[PDB]
A paper describes a structure:
pmcRibosomes are essential macromolecular machines responsible for protein synthesis. Here, we report the cryo-electron microscopy (cryo-EM) structure of the ribosome from [name], a previously unreported high-resolution structure from a model mesophilic methanogenic archaeon. Compared to ribosomes from extremophiles, the [name] ribosome has a simplified architecture, lacking paralogous duplications and containing a reduced complement of ribosomal proteins. [name] is a methanogenic mesophilic (∼35 °C), nonhalotolerant (0.4 M NaCl), neutrophile (pH∼7) and strictly anaerobic archaeon that has emerged as a model organism for its methane production and scavenging.
Cryo-EM data processing of the [name] ribosomes from methanol-grown cells revealed a minor subset of ribosome particles (∼10%) that form a 50S dimer. Further analysis revealed that the dimer is stabilized by large, previously uncharacterized macromolecules situated between the 50S subunits. We designate this complex as the MRDF, which displays twofold symmetry and an elongated X-shape, measuring ∼155 Å in length and ∼74 Å in width. To overcome anisotropic cryo-EM density caused by the elongated MRDF, we collected cryo-EM data at both 0° and 25° tilt angles and applied C2 symmetry during the single particle reconstruction. This approach yielded an isotropic 3.5 Å resolution map, enabling confident model building. Using ModelAngelo, we identified MRDF as a heterotetramer composed of two copies of the purine biosynthesis enzyme PurH (bifunctional phosphoribosylaminoimidazolecarboxamide formyltransferase/5′-inosine monophosphate cyclohydrolase, MA4012) and two molecules of archaeal translation [name] (aEF2, MA1257). The N-terminal domains of PurH (PurH-NTDs) mediate dimerization, and each PurH monomer associates with one aEF2 molecule, forming a heterotetramer. The MRDF is anchored to both 50S subunits through multiple interfaces: the PurH dimer interacts via both its NTD and CTD with the 50S surface, while each aEF2 binds the sarcin–ricin loop of the adjacent 50S subunit. This architecture occludes 30S subunit binding, rendering the 50S subunit inactive for translation and suggesting a role in ribosome hibernation. The structural inactivity of both PurH and aEF2 in the dimerized state—supported by empty active sites—suggests that MRDF formation may occur under nutrient-limited conditions, where both purine biosynthesis substrate and GTP levels are low.
Residue numbers in the entry:
A (entry chain BN): 1 to 174
B (entry chain Bf): 1 to 92
C (entry chain BR): 2 to 97
D (entry chain BF): 1 to 165
E (entry chain BI): 4 to 99, 111 to 173
The structure:
Amino acid sequence: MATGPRYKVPFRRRREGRTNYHLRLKLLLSRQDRVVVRKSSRNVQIQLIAPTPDGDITYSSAVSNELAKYGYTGATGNTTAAYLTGLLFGLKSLQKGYEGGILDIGLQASSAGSRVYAALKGVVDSGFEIPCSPEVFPPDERIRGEHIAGYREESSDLPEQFEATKEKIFAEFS
Amino acid sequence: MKIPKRFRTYCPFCKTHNEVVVERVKKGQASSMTHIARQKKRQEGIGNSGKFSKVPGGDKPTKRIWLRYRCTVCKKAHQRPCFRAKKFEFKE
Amino acid sequence: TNSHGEKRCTRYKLQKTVRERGISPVSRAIQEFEEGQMVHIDIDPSVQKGMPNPKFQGSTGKVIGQRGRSYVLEVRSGNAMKEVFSLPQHLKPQKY
Amino acid sequence: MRTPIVEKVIVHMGVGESGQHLVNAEDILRNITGQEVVRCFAKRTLPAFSIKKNEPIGCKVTLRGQKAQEFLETALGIVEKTLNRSQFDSFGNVSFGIEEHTDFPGMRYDPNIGVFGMDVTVVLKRPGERICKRRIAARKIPAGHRVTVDDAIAFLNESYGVEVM
Amino acid sequence: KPGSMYRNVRQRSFTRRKYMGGVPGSQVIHYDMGDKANTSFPVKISLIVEEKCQIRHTALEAARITANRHLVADTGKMGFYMKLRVYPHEVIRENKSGMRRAFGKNVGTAARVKPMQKIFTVAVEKQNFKAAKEALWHAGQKLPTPCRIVVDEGAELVQ
RNA sequence: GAGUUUGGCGGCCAUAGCGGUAGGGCAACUCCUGUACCCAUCCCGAACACAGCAGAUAAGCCUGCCCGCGUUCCUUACUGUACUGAAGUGUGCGAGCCUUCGGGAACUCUGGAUCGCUGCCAAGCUCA
RNA sequence: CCUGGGGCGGGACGCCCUUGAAAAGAUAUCAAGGGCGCGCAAUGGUUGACUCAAGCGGGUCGGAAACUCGCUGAAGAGUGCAAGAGCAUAAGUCAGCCUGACGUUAUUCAGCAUAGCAGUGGAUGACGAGACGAAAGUCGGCUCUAGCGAACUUUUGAGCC
RNA sequence: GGGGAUCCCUCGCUCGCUUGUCAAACUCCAAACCCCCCGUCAUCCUAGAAAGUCGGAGUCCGGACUGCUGGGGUA
């Protein structure tokens, strides 16, 4: 709302409402790579990001769309998909060489049992070292996809296909 | 101002955070067997007594609140640099 | 009468321009400097910590070490060499 | 997708003085709304009401969904489905006041309680006002996606048949 | 109290009235004279000072009174427009013991004007140019600076 | 392998803002549908969260355009003006001001542009 | 003691901010504006969630004096108290849990432009213990700069000589 | 909100678009000097740079000219 020369406009990313710069400063003071976890309504996405004076640089990137090749047919935007994406991202970064980072959720609310924390647990179980406390993890039943007991009998195959995709991804990255 | 009677803080002796009770420190009576008392009694005679005929000075507008923190576990007390307040109370 | 505080005569020394007030760009806080590198001291008023004396604002110091987050700088002040401690938020590399 | 749906309906009782009258007002409002009400707090002490800073003064409740729809139908019944133009805000919102909580079935007049009035306001938004309410990527809606007074009145006519005089 | 006291400019400005106390109000009442609404006066002369000086509000009021009287007498009550451009912004103070704590008390207000700065502007028709010029010369006689009249508009209308 | 679309993280932090106009979504995003659940409301699944079959580009987002306010840059006039570094047996009754050499505005005006540029990665694609 | 002689008046006699001060630093006067000799277990730390002042429109003797809804609103509020500076997904408001308003210790500032007191800033140091938080971090009080005192003496704390 | 039962009508401030003026303690702008650092030339420097240590002091009544419209002051 530039009223005149005295008006102050925020940064572009803050104007777009995509970043908290106070959190960004606190995370950059780590001097560690950021495991940036962002979730949309239909899938989840994880990146490994390092700062540069010219911008951010990404070392590794796993999305939910990669699970279909490993044999996942469930919704990419739920807990099982988030956990699988986290495991895939962690294993891929371990393959590439990077093995450490700090969790970056941005503006996402910190709620126990969220898809963000399912992806975090997947990254942890992939061997990718990252500080955390287990109390924010989702229950193992709903990481396997016990929410399929609610309304969908079609989704009753989520635990078995969960295990199958997990074993296939472990075979691919081990 | 009010400070709580009991709160959890660091004990320098047991080297942990324990509960400690705060106690106001009362100034004690000066011993009559101290070296300064003996020197005063020795320099008392006829005439001016020097520094022993000095009248005590004035007072600052506010005095510090002399507090002492006793660990509830080892029962040892330590005293820290203290604030300066007109009115002091313990929260209970 | 006139005081002798650290913030003496800092009204414009510790001002921000109109369109840079607020949170500063965070990139300036995670920049690393090498031993012997020359860096300017341009104090950021919004970063109320790690700030050297405003007397050294506008001076070029030489990085001689690091004390955690902050950098130690050798800075000329008249004819003396001072060791100035500064977070990188107030620092800036010299360009050749 | 430009139907001016009902974002929310708010019922507010400005008693003006806390205590047993406030408790009775909040209980009757909870009965008439089917949802917990919240106590409004004064922000400036004033000897006229003799209230102080941050003292409970009134109550208000927000209703969303079929509960809001049914209560709005009821209140439009008490107003006989009537609502004139001047009630409407400049941006599609309306509010009107009533006096007799006894007009809502399921609650009885009490000589101790008296009769407390209240104002009900429904806010008319469009399907997609989440853009300004969500946390991430929260942009203000453009002026071309808001709701006009005639749009709101047409919606009211075609939804509840509330003629505007 | 002669105007030669607070005449030379030797000092910084003194105008921030929130950091001083008790400034006497200015004697000058109006700043626009004659016919204020009309703007279609063809001839438009002005009085410019040729030295950097401080003009007290009483001197401004005296010059305004004399110019306004002359213009009203010659051109009529609405035959002219007169604008006093400068406001007394500087605060004149006086040291009222001797020289200990000599920072003065506020005694008046003055306008700090620069060389070639317009003080008064008079707009009139073609036939009233000499009357306006004579009145503005009379006004300049009351000011603490040498002055000159310049024609701003209507030079070809006069000659 | 080059380029485009979209998404994520960013840099400079209005040249990017505020405002107006016309088009798009196959994928992606989004709006959007619910509240078994993890999580939540000083009340409200509004939000957050979870689980998501439709509809929709009307919004967010993207592309094109508009000089309208704001900003930034250029151009002409003001103008080498204001101011100023050095020096001066130049000058004023005085407050001061002048000459030379060297630097050099701001505002306004004439006429223009500016309705962001840009780094890394990923995924869909468009290849010889 | 200072002091446009001294005296009377006053304290420019200790500390902090703006101007004076001439765009690095320094810079005097009984120079101008002034303030401080405190308050606060919350008016403090951390986390979460929110956004303020003031206008415009809607809502009942709830009056243009309340409360509530919608729009505008980079801050025109608040942040304990002078002045200046800082701060908007906050350094503000509310709520959850807390006491880092922690013991010891090293440097350098700029701590007082200082050769030079007490003492302060650090805050990025270190050791040892913690609060909050997924973590990153933040916390050595209150957003930064005032709120204070040598030697000797006594009293108090822990263990020693 | 100032003036002489339908507040029957007169209207100063307040808020904007234009005129006219301002500021030590205002700044959307913004020099010339000046300051730190880098390179360069220039000068000094092994007939000893910068730095360090030690011996001996004097000095803390100053004044003037040219600028800073320096501050204060009628001067």
